[PDB]
Structure formats: structure tokens, C-alpha cells
């Protein structure tokens, strides 16, 4: 039973098992209008306006498929480093132009402003209750230095 669980978890999905989406049949409909459609249905199946269905497709056939594709694939290392720099320049260019889209960021802040400032006000009022007392304690002590100093000088002067 331990062996069967080891076979199902590994052969469940490569992306899902490793690490990190909303359901969109209209996005799959808009993207089509063949390989792109295959990955779209694959994403909708694993995730399970969303219907689930595909559950009889996804270990030995995948290993042979991976070994065969590896055979088909210094010079290869430089062509990947050059293309990675080109995509990095395209990512820095798409970011510099922005700085529809502006309304989403403001609403993201309104969530933050809400979430954060509510936390701030709770952290503040919790602190304030404990620390306004200690502020008074600390601040009324500071006033004592200002009188302990002013007397000091008059005594030194008179001395």
C-alpha cells in the first residue's frame, strides 16, 4: 500500500507535484479562435464556471517518452544563455512602459489598506493601551530632567 501511493503521487502531475489559476472555458475558447487546446484541458482536469471530466490518462509510458525526447535534444549552452538575456530585456521593457491596468492596482491597495490598516489599528490600539501608560511614565520622567537641569545651573552659578 506504501508502494501504490508512491506510484500515484509521482505520476499524478509534474507541475502539480513540484510547485506553483482560475477556471476559464472562455479563455480556452478565445485562445483557440491544437497543442494549446491540449494543455488547456490538461490544466482544467488537474485543478479539479468549471466542469471536471478527464480522469483516465495520466508511469512507464512517460519514462520512455522522456528518454526518447532526451535523445532528440557548449553551443547549446550559449544559445540558451543568449535567448534568456533576450527574454530578460523583453521583461524589463514591458515593466518600464507601464510605470484598465491601473484600476486593479488601486483595488489591490484598497484590500491592503483595509487588511493592513485594520491590523495597524489593532496593533496600534493594543500597543497604545499598554504604551500610552508607559509613554506618560517615560514622558513625565523626561520633564524631570528639564527641571533637574534648570536647578543644576542656578546652583552652579550661585556656587
Amino acid at each position: 500500500d506504501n508502494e501504490r501511493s508512491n506510484i500515484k503521487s509521482g505520476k499524478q502531475l509534474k507541475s502539480r507535484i513540484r510547485k506553483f489559476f482560475a477556471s476559464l472555458p472562455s479563455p480556452k475558447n478565445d485562445f483557440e479562435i491544437d497543442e494549446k487546446e491540449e494543455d488547456a484541458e490538461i490544466a482544467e482536469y488537474e485543478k479539479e464556471e468549471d466542469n471536471f471530466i478527464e480522469p483516465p490518462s495520466q508511469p512507464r509510458v512517460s519514462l520512455v517518452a522522456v528518454p526518447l525526447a532526451y535523445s532528440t535534444l557548449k553551443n547549446n549552452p550559449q544559445s540558451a544563455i543568449d535567448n534568456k538575456y533576450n527574454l530578460l530585456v523583453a521583461n524589463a521593457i514591458n515593466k518600464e512602459p507601464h510605470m484598465e491596468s491601473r484600476m486593479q492596482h488601486i483595488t489591490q491597495g484598497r484590500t491592503s489598506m483595509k487588511i493592513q490598516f485594520k491590523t495597524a489599528m489593532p496593533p496600534t490600539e493594543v500597543l497604545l493601551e499598554s504604551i500610552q501608560s508607559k509613554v506618560e511614565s517615560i514622558e513625565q520622567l523626561q520633564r524631570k530632567l528639564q527641571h533637574v537641569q534648570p536647578l543644576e545651573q542656578q546652583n552652579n552659578e550661585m556656587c
Binding site: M99, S101, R102, G109, S112, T119, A120
Partner: protein
């Protein structure tokens, strides 16, 4: 000159007000409010962790 005239130089009264559906200018001003609010909420976390122990020690 500041003391004689009795006038302090004005600071950035901008972050507090802002406005939604603005432009590229308020897109910046909005993104400013987020990062500083996250810094704020992180700046309140390390205070509350110690809490009153750091205050009473001083």
C-alpha cells in the same frame, strides 16, 4: 533664514491623499502606498513581538 522668517520648508504632502482612476502619475502614487503599507505592517510586527518589554527596558 528659516528661523528668522518663521517658516519651515514644506514636505511631501502627497502619499496621504491620492485618488483612484487617476493616470500614469497616480499609478505611481498608488504603488507607493502599497510598498510603504507593507513596510508599515512589517514595522508594526517587530514592535509588537517584543511589545512592552522594549519600552520598559528604556
Amino acid at each position: 533664514a528659516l528661523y528668522t522668517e518663521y517658516l519651515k520648508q514644506r514636505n511631501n504632502k502627497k502619499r496621504r491623499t491620492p485618488d483612484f482612476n487617476d493616470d500614469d502619475d497616480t499609478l505611481f502614487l498608488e504603488e507607493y502606498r502599497r510598498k510603504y503599507p507593507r513596510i508599515d505592517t512589517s514595522r508594526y510586527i517587530p514592535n509588537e513581538s517584543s511589545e512592552v518589554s522594549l519600552l520598559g527596558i528604556v
